[PDB]
Amino acid sequence: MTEIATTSGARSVGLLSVGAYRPERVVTNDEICQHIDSSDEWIYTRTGIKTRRFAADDESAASMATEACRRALSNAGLSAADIDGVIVTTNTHFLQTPPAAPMVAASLGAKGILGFDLSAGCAGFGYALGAAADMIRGGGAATMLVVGTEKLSPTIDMYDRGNCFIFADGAAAVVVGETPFQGIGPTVAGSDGEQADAIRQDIDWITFAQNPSGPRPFVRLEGPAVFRWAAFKMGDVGRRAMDAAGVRPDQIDVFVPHQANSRINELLVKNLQLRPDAVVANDIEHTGNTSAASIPLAMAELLTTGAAKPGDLALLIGYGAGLSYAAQVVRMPK
Amino acid sequence: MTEIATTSGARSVGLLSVGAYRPERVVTNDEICQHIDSSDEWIYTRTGIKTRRFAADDESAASMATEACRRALSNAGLSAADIDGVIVTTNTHFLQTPPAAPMVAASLGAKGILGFDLSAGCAGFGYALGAAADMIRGGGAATMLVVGTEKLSPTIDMYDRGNCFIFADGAAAVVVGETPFQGIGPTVAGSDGEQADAIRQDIDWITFAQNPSGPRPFVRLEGPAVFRWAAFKMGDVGRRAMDAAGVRPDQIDVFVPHQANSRINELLVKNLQLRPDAVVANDIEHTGNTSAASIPLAMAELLTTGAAKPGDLALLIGYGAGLSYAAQVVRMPK
Ligand SMILES: CCCCCCCCCCCC(=O)O
């Protein structure tokens, strides 16, 4: 009887490199407070944030994704010609269509390679990485680009006081391909749609379009709800990711949680029973919460300062919007 | 050092069922011809469309995805409790965040299952299907929901004689899980970002938001460009999908191309060398082009009339926006 064929690729997959792009402009809490009622100290105190980058007007999630990919390719010693596909994960591509992925591939000179946009709120990176690994192992690609990119600044209500100092822009990509050793552990993910409102665009685009003189949409954040959720639930997610990867808490060298808030992550570093000398990402201090691009930008920073070395065993935990989370254990890139 | 472990699932994966939801408001060509200088015969002879469905104002891509999934689960004799994850593919979720996936899972009572939104324009279904299959084989889930949903009507410029009669609304989901036989063939996909302009939202949401009194965004289509592209390039894509699946053209029982234009698809049927009695989807006549929901809606239609039977060998070819395409050979569901 005719049977549909089954294919497969390299069983061992890993992060060949990481490339990060940060917008030239810097924005201080004071600059922020020059339109808000609070302190440049109460900010960096309740949220380890001191400064963040805002992209120019002529930039987009797509353009920053492209530059991030160029850097990842160079850091991996590859050219666009070595890439089989690209997954752009973002929440700020301001067009219902076309997707950013095909445009990014074109800008890289990457022919008609497959690609798509993945949106899972802040945890889109973990979902995209897992997807790239599954595709490569399944034989649908051999080498891929996974880039998290975000241009949130244009969606911030400078008068929100609840998040205007939280979100920021930026993009970071990783090259995923075959490695001698297993570099990407099993994906652990889930969500809580019951709390979809905790991080949302308040007005949908069509309603706004039908009421142009009415209020325009802005990103709203129910900080406490998110703070509690992550702090209390990401510890369990961390253990599952380690368990699935067959690793124990004490074997983790690097911890890269979503750069949502220092207070949440410091609490997680303790609840995960990581060893005392475990390196922890704190890229948020001068980058803020870049949602989907957060983790890959944080990984790049840890490597940047040498705090993390290639080969290091890291625990990645993305949590955020939609109330989605995605985690995995990986071997640091570059 | 410590080797990161792996996990794996069922090698044989397939379509357990399909569930389709079509908005109740039927819009005829004559209704469309109240705002353009055309006629029913002109539109029908050139596109193959006679009527299409428009969703109500209180409906959304997410609400239609929910209902489609409910039907799919029922057609598979399963409950939300049997689902491990859900992938929503769409291009008309009018919120930059949160994603529709977490909300859809919540609405189905599928507690906190993993999920994300995937946009590859019109070919998002093929990509999501392949991703679901790769995840299940990768052991990241055992059973999943893949739902294409689209509420394009609000993005249509009623005066655009180039596409006002083309796009429509609807949603259809399939349950993906382990099957005795291999039911999903290898994914064959790619794109042409050089032609990203062929199907696009003309004005990005932020620019509009910063000039509310200016022109609002609408979907635009460069018909001829798309027509030529699909007609000339999908044949090669179909052959590759069949090759990867180890099947010959004559073995295809059912052909389900994206319902973009009946003339493009009639040309493809011939160019693919399908046998004379091959059943070809023509759901477009009363459904129009529902982009991401097109293929699963067409599969449901063929099964409903009994034209396609469960177990039938089918060739699916998604093509569209961003200039993205995704294809695979599968065994019909339900
Ligand atoms: C004859 C003019 C009508 C336009 C027909 C062009 C066919 C392509 C439209 C479908 C676009 C898509 O892939 O979603």
From Swiss-Prot, chains A, B:
Subcellular location: Cytoplasm
GO cellular component: cytoplasm
Pathway connected to this protein: Lipid metabolism; fatty acid biosynthesis; Lipid metabolism; mycolic acid biosynthesis
Active-site residues per Swiss-Prot or TrEMBL entry: 122, 258, 289
Gene Ontology molecular function: any one: 3-oxoacyl-[acyl-carrier-protein] synthase activity
Gene3D superfamilies linked: 3.40.47.10
EC class name: transferase
Annotated catalysed reactions: malonyl-[ACP] + dodecanoyl-CoA + H(+) = 3-oxotetradecanoyl-[ACP] + CO2 + CoA
Alphabetized UniProt keyword annotations: Acyltransferase, Cytoplasm, Fatty acid biosynthesis, Fatty acid metabolism, Lipid biosynthesis, Lipid metabolism, Multifunctional enzyme, Transferase
GO BP terms, alphabetized: fatty acid biosynthetic process
The UniProt record lists the keyword Kinase: no
Region (ACP-binding): 259-263
Enzyme Commission number(s): 2.3.1.301
Signal sequence bounds: none
CDD domains found in the cross-reference section: KAS_III
General function of this protein: Catalyzes the condensation reaction of fatty acid synthesis by the addition to an acyl acceptor of two carbons from malonyl-ACP. Catalyzes the first condensation reaction which initiates fatty acid synthesis and may therefore play a role in governing the total rate of fatty acid production. Possesses both acetoacetyl-ACP synthase and acetyl transacylase activities. Its substrate specificity determines the biosynthesis of branched-chain and/or straight-chain of fatty acids.
UniProt free text on domains: The last Arg residue of the ACP-binding site is essential for the weak association between ACP/AcpP and FabH.
Family: Belongs to the thiolase-like superfamily. FabH family.
Quaternary structure and partners: Homodimer.
Protein name listed in UniProt: Mycobacterial beta-ketoacyl-[acyl-carrier-protein] synthase III
Organism, as annotated: Mycobacterium tuberculosis (strain CDC 1551 / Oshkosh)
